[PDB]
Homo-oligomer: A and B are copies of this chain.
Amino acid sequence: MIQRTPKIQVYSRHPAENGKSNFLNCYVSGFHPSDIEVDLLKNGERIEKVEHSDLSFSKDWSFYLLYYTEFTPTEKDEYACRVNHVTLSQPKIVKWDRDM
């Protein structure tokens, strides 16, 4: 068994302009078990017409690597990152894209 307490973020879709319709969000992430009760409140009181409610499940068991160093870009010099891993058919080279 596992249990994980949710993190809770409350934010609006856009920056709030008083009187301008907007969407209010509660992002509740990383909770287990899935049993839960979530409400948005106005002046302490439950808002009952909440239109959207998107639930997903995520699992992970994986590694992360940040690999970096000082450099000085120029016009002609091309940079890239090359990775080799058993899940690849061959080494993968991803070029650096300045000004995506």
Contacts and interface: CB of A to CB of B under 8 A. Distances in A.
A37 B86 contact: no
Contacts of A57: 62-64
Task: Name the interface size band of chain A.
Answer: 35 or more
Contacts of A24: 68-71, 73, 79, 96
Contacts of A38: 65, 67, 81-84
20 contacts: A8-B83, A10-B81, A11-B97, A12-B71, A24-B70, A25-B66, A27-B66, A31-B85, A31-B87, A32-B61, A32-B63, A38-B81, A40-B69, A41-B81, A41-B93, A42-B79, A43-B77, A52-B66, A57-B64, A58-B62
Interface string A7-19: 0111111011111
A96 B63 contact: no
A10 B73 CA distance: 14
